[PDB]
Each structure stands twice: as C-alpha cells, then as structure tokens.
Amino acid sequence: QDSLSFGFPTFPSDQKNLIFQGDAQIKNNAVQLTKTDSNGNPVASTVGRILFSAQVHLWEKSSSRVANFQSQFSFSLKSPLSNGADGIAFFIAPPDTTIPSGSGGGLLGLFAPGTAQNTSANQVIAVEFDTFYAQDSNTWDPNYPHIGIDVNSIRSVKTVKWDRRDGQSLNVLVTFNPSTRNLDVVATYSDGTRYEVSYEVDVRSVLPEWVRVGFSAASGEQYQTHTLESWSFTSTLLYTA
Amino acid sequence: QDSLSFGFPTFPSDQKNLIFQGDAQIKNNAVQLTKTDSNGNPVASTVGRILFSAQVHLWEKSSSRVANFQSQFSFSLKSPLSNGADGIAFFIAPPDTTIPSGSGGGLLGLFAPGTAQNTSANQVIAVEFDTFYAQDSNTWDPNYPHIGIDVNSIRSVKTVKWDRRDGQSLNVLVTFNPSTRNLDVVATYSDGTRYEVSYEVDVRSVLPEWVRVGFSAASGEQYQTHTLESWSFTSTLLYTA
C-alpha cells in the first residue's frame, strides 16, 4: 500500500499484529520491553523489542516517491535505583531484523558490539532516549542523559540534553518530511517541559524500500522498566520536487 | 491496534502485505483474481483470493466495542463470452481462512459445496457482484445479474438488480456503522448509474473478534477476468450503546 496507518491507544493482552522479540511482553495494557520480576520490578541483563507485522513502504524507486511518516508514542521509565539503564528507542529497519548477538546494555538491542560504530555495516535509523552514559562502557555517549538520532551507529549523529523523570510518561512525536528530508523529534512531559532534536537524512540511502518499525529497549548492569504505553503511526508515499 | 487503515491507489507488482491464494496475482498494476493466459484472456476453472496480512480488530468483548469500517474499491470484468462468470466478492472471514475444496464457480471461492447454504457451518460476510445466474446450476440465485449481501451462505440475505458492463470500472463503497448495525453498499459506474443495498447485521454473532479482509473471485465453465484496480480500507473500534 501507498499509505498505512495504525493506532494503539493502549495495549490489550490479545495482540495479533505485533512481533515480540527478546523479553518483550504485554502487561497491564502496556508493553514491557524489558523483563520484570513477579513484583513488577525491573531486572538486570534483559533486552526486548516489538515490531508491527505489516511492512511499511518507505520509498519507491520506480515512482521516485519517498514516504512522509509520523510516529507518536508515550513511555515511562521506573527504577528503584537512581541510575536507571539503559534506555528505549523507536527504530526503523529491514523487515527481517532480529536482536543482534551481544546487543544488550548500552547497545540498546540495536547493534552488534563489533560493528556498533561502523556505519557501512548497519541499516537502521533510531531515536534513542538514553539514560546511562558511563564513559567506561558507553564511550560513544555525551556525558549526560540525552535524546539522540542514530543513523547506522550507536554514536548518535545528533543529540539533545534530556532529563529522566522516574515514573513520568514522556509524549513523543517523530516525523519525517521527504520534501526537506528532516527527521524531527519533539518530546514533552505533562508539565510542558519540551525537548527537540532534528537531523537531515536521505532515507533512500540508508534503508531498503520496505521496512518494519518498532521499539527496542535494554538493561545491562543497571536497570529500569521501559514501558510503552501508546503508539500511533502513519506513512504516505509522496512525490518530491 | 484499535484502528487500522491502508490504501492501494494501484497495485505495483512489488507487494509485501498481501496474502495470495489460488490463481490470484498482480498484472499491470492490478490484481487479477482469476487466471488469464499469455494474451491476458480469461480461462475456465480458476479461483483466486487476496487478503491483507494484518488482522483487523472487528470487535472487542472485554470493552463492548465494535468497529466502524469502510472499504472503497474498484474493479472491472471482461469476457468475450455473452455469459461471463462467476463474479467477485469483498469478504470478511476468520484470519486462517483458505480456499475451500470445491468452492469454484458459483461458490465464488467462498463456500464448500456441502455447507454452502448452511449458515451454522460458516463464518463469512461478503458483498458479491454475481454475473452468472443459470437457474439449473446456481439454484440459489435470483434470475438476473445482481449485487448480494452474503452472511454465512451463498444464498444472499438480500440482492438488488445490477448491470454487468464489460470492461467498465465499478466503484464501490462498503460501510458498517456499529451504532445502527447497518452494512451499507453503494456502487456506481462512471456515468452516474448507482446501485444501493443495505442490511442490518450484528457482526459479533457472525465473526470472531479478529478477522482478515479481502477479495475472492472464481470462474467455472464460463469465464471472465476479475480485476481489482484499487482499494482503501479503514476501521476503528467504537463504544456501542
């Protein structure tokens, strides 16, 4: 299809169009990307992801069209500690994507250790909400919590200082305009605190014509829950000047 | 997802979200449901169907909600014969639906011979555009080309006279309003000729909560092409009093 749209106001237990990978599962109307114990508390060493089953036609060579898309979602992070890790990411990748070996902790379940910073070795675009930046393990991170745009590398091409708020839902709007090629990210807490980051990227040179979209999260030594509460997505192929 | 929509202004041969059954396949940016030879001429004894891969949440028991959906599509039929057969149908059925054995010809690839008219043995809602009505073989049909609403039986719960126009596209809008429980059908030819038929049906008593939507077509001894030219669909779960 030229256009596709779907919306999950909440996540009821009986899902049919979601691909669950790793430790991801539905709990209390929300998707728990990372594993939690019987009490509902976060645990260490866990990676989980979800993808919508239907493939998205991001661009079409024959017609020279590129899709304009928008992904709106909200999530919350909770941890008994104060150094919650490692973060959650909205991502777009080839349809057959699977959790790379050794992609836990700071790699957010998106990159393999040996090629995490090799751009010509990856095919992924992600918007990360990174809460752990210890310079000894996450050497590629700025020294502070941040929202970043990742293009084929765990080392963001652009980041913005961000504030982690335990238990508070962050509302996010990610949009891609094929006309200007700008991928814009706007995130806000209920009190109006806003964060914005954007980057110009030609999706045609990074991803194949058909892709799958979803979320990924992980916790290494440090942990926190990564709760996806809602998600709506829409894409439409358009002709650019 | 509570809501889902997709649009196929045309059908490029590079499809990823369509399930093809039988002889259905993409030809010249359109779906040819029934088999055609090298020159694109229709042949006898062929059945074909397509379904969108993502399952649609028609209704939800736990929340007492039922979906409001709309399906807009256009097709054309062509045959050198004076009695082209057998017809095309938009249908809704359980996710695992496959072409029943012996469902060819007048059964439109939708029903099995043994239970074609047994309502307690089927789970399908379809809007048929039936061009073959020979009273000796299609004993259940009125004696003329017609549009029919089928609920668990090849013997339509309702039909209205329809005119078959060789090689002319028919635009159809099928809608279901959960409030009134009305399934409305409106079809038109490019010259303004209009056909309308409506039927009240509680989809909850006929179909499971999750279903797949698509098209089916067949030709027995008499034949014609059944070309799906475009299709858009949208559904949203709504609270029903």
Ligand SMILES: CO[C@H]1O[C@H](CO)[C@@H](O)[C@H](O)[C@H]1O
């Ligand atoms: C000590 O390092 C480990 O734990 C941290 C914090 O969870 C992760 O960032 C890192 O990738 C993992 O290897």
Ligand SMILES: CO[C@H]1O[C@H](CO)[C@@H](O)[C@H](O)[C@H]1O
């Ligand atoms: C002569 O009968 C055969 O051909 C007609 C026309 O195609 C079909 O309607 C029927 O099901 C099939 O058995």
Ligand SMILES: [Ca+2]
């Ligand atoms: Ca990090």
Ligand SMILES: [Ca+2]
């Ligand atoms: Ca018939």
Ligand SMILES: [Mn+2]
């Ligand atoms: Mn980072």
Ligand SMILES: [Mn+2]
């Ligand atoms: Mn009929």
